[PDB]
Design a protein around this ligand. Structure first.
Ligand code: HEM
Length: 371
């Protein structure tokens, strides 16, 4: 496990904080490699798509996967897909999101004495929301959500592969279904508005990618946000009493959690001079989001003033689902602290297990909660 993906519970490790002190750019192999830790340097790399490519370095096509596209084709695909994420489309989803939150919290609560928050809320909430976002029939949602989790998390590689083929097959069918009948959800919107500008294979790959990312990223984000709130009970009470704190609170949980520890490796397409270093064409750069988002001595503080974090990245690849992610947190967090004023850990903090942020996201495996 490379240094930029090591944690002590939620925190970067002291040896990584020490390397950050030495400078913004290090000769370090995460995957000639560079590890980028400087705030301005990370910004600069991510904004400079023309000199720093997102394509895997080779000496494999991923149709519809925006992260893997460089910005001739990235530009056309992104603007074909962007309308599905607009602020207006998002606000129209709000009612189903509130409904889903309440339903899943009802189910979580209905379980015996202590309950795992990951199993009963943190996975189900975003998984169901991702299905709605994609326009998945209500009756298929439980099935598909299980498949999503299992495809990303199963101890059994056979099972990940099986669940993964199941997802691919389901979204191909959903894609052709929505191509014929462009109704509710991301695929319908994209077909109605840019149907001519996109192939069935791009649309299907994009559907799968977005389904998996929306469910998985937010599951991790939601469970860590709640972990943070229950281990800081004062702040939980602040948010309950000052509900107008939700916006800076959602920024703080994104900043502090740093769910994506590093975006895709960037490949230099030209020689570049940066922070006193000679980057050569073909060098591979890892941007450390833990470096940029976290500082030694930082404490979780929902009243935090300015948010300069890069939890969603930066530049042309800046997380396109951000509006949906922020919306979920804005609904789910006030609902959680409102319904459960005495929410707390049911086990010692040292019992908690964390999935490392390589591959993304960093997550808490299990969150036994009380009251
Ligand atoms: C809080 C949860 C999330 C976090 C922290 C997060 C983080 C990120 C980051 C850091 C990137 C940039 C990757 C890169 O530059 O290589 C990204 C891109 C992307 N994300 Fe998110 N994400 C989250 C949730 C979501 C959701 C809910 C969706 C689906 C609606 C989504 C879909 C995407 C897509 C399609 C891209 C690629 C956009 C592009 O490359 O132009 N993510 N995400």
């Amino acid at each position: 496990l490379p240094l930029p993906h090591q944690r002590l519970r939620l925190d970067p490790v002291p040896e990584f904080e020490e390397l950050q002190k030495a400078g913004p750019l290090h000769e370090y192999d995460t995957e000639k490699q560079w590890l980028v830790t400087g705030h301005d340097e990370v910004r600069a790399i991510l904004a400079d798509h023309e000199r720093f490519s997102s394509m895997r370095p080779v000496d494999a096509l991923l149709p519809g996967i925006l992260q893997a596209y460089d910005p001739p084709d990235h530009t056309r695909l992104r603007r074909t897909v962007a309308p599905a994420y607009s602020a207006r489309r998002m606000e129209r989803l709000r009612p189903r999101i509130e409904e889903i939150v309440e339903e899943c919290l009802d189910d979580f609560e209905s379980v015996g004495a202590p309950v795992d928050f990951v199993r009963h809320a943190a996975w189900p909430i975003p998984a169901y929301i991702a299905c709605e976002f994609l326009g998945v029939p209500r009756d298929d949602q439980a099935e598909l959500s299980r498949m999503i989790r299992e495809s990303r998390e199963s101890r059994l590689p056979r099972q990940r592969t099986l669940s993964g083929l199941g997802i691919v097959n389901y979204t191909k069918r959903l894609t052709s279904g929505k191509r014929r009948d462009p109704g509710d959800g991301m695929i319908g919107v994209i077909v109605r508005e840019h149907g001519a500008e996109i192939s069935d294979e791009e649309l299907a790959g994009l559907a799968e990618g977005n389904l998996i990312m929306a469910a998985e990223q937010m599951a991790a984000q939601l469970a860590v946000a709640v972990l943070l709130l229950v281990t800081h009970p004062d702040q939980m009470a602040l948010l309950r009493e000052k509900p107008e704190l939700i916006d800076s609170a959602t920024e703080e949980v994104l900043r502090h959690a740093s769910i994506v520890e590093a975006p895709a490796p960037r490949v230099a397409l030209a020689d570049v001079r940066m922070a006193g270093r000679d980057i050569h064409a073909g060098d591979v750069l890892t941007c450390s989001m833990l470096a940029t988002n976290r500082a030694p001595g930082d404490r979780f503080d929902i009243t935090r003033e300015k948010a300069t974090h890069m939890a969603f990245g930066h530049g042309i690849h800046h997380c396109i689902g951000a509006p949906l992610a922020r919306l979920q947190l804005r609904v789910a967090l006030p609902a959680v602290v409102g319904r459960f004023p005495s929410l707390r850990l049911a086990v010692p903090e040292e019992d908690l297990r964390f999935k490392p942020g390589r591959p993304a996201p960093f997550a808490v495996e299990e969150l036994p909660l009380e009251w």
